Design a protein around this ligand. Structure first.
Ligand SMILES: Cc1nc2ccccc2n1Cc1ccc2c(c1)nc(CNc1ccc(C(=N)N)cc1)n2C
Ligand SMILES: [Ca+2]
Length: 223
C-alpha cells in the first residue's frame, strides 16, 4: 500500500496473508472455511495466515491453516487478467472470533464515488521496494467507468473497476494482490493490477466481485 496508514492490530479481521515461506498475496475470509483471492496469486503449497498484524513476529491471535484446494476461475485469462478471482478452501475451519472474522459478499454492485477500504502487506513505495511488517490501510473511492477506461484504453473488461486517485501518491501495489476492497461492509473488489503503483493517471484496477457472487456460491456449495 503506497500512501496509506498503519491499520492497527486486528482492525481488519477478514484480511488474510497467503504464505509459502514468505508473504506473497492477500486474501479475504468469507466464511470459516473459505478465502477469496486473485487467480494470479495461484501457487501450490499455500498456507493461509489469519489474525495477522506483524507478519514477521508471532504476537498471538494467529491461525496458520493449510489450503486443501485452490479453485482458479475456469475462464481466468492470464494475458488480460480477466476473471482474476480464486477461491481457497481451508484444510480445517478457522476459529472465528473478535480478531478473525469473515466479510460479507455484496448483494449489488457499488457505484462510482463509493469510498472503500483497501489493505495489505504489499510494497509501500512508488519507486523502489519497501515491504512493511504490519498491515497498511488506504481509503479510496471507486472511479467512474469512463475515467477508468480513459486511463487504460482497451484493457478494462466488465469484470474490472478502477479505484484510487488520479493525482497519484496513494494506491495498492505488488504484494497487496488478492487483497480486499471493502465498501460499506461488503467485499466489492480484489486487488488485481495496475501500471506501476501510485502513478499519476494510472489508478489501481480491481476484480469486480459483484459479478461473481453466484459463481462463488455455486462453487462453495459443491466443494
Ligand atoms: C503486462 C500487461 N499485459 C496486459 C494485458 C491487458 C491488461 C493489462 C496488462 N498488463 C499490465 C499488468 C498486468 C498484471 C499485473 C501488473 C501489470 N502488475 C501486476 C502486479 N501487481 C499489482 C497490484 C496492484 C497495482 C496497483 N494498484 N497499482 C499494481 C500492480 N500484475 C498482477
Ligand atoms: Ca504475526
Amino acid at each position: 500500500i503506497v500512501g496509506g496508514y498503519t491499520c492497527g492490530a486486528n482492525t481488519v479481521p477478514y484480511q488474510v496473508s497467503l504464505n509459502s515461506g514468505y508473504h506473497f498475496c492477500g486474501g479475504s475470509l468469507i466464511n470459516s472455511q473459505w478465502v477469496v483471492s486473485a487467480a494470479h496469486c495461484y501457487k501450490s503449497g499455500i498456507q493461509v495466515r489469519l489474525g495477522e498484524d506483524n507478519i514477521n513476529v508471532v504476537e498471538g491471535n494467529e491461525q496458520f491453516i493449510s489450503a486443501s484446494k485452490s479453485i482458479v476461475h475456469p475462464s481466468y485469462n492470464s494475458n488480460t487478467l480477466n476473471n482474476d478471482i480464486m477461491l481457497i478452501k481451508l484444510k480445517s475451519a478457522a476459529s472465528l472470533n473478535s480478531r478473525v472474522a469473515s466479510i460479507s459478499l455484496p448483494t449489488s454492485c457499488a457505484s462510482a464515488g463509493t469510498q472503500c477500504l483497501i489493505s495489505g502487506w504489499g510494497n509501500t513505495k512508488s519507486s523502489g521496494t519497501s515491504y512493511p511488517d504490519v498491515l497498511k490501510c488506504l481509503k479510496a473511492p471507486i472511479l467512474s467507468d469512463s475515467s477508468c477506461k480513459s486511463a487504460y484504453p482497451g484493457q478494462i473488461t466488465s469484470n474490472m473497476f478502477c479505484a484510487g486517485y488520479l493525482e497519484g501518491g496513494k494506491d495498492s501495489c505488488q504484494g497487496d494482490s488478492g487483497g480486499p476492497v471493502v465498501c460499506s461492509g461488503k467485499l466489492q473488489g480484489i486487488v488485481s493490477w495496475g501500471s506501476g503503483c501510485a502513478q499519476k493517471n494510472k489508478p489501481g484496477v480491481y476484480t469486480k466481485v459483484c459479478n461473481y457472487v453466484s459463481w462463488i456460491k455455486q462453487t462453495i456449495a459443491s466443494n
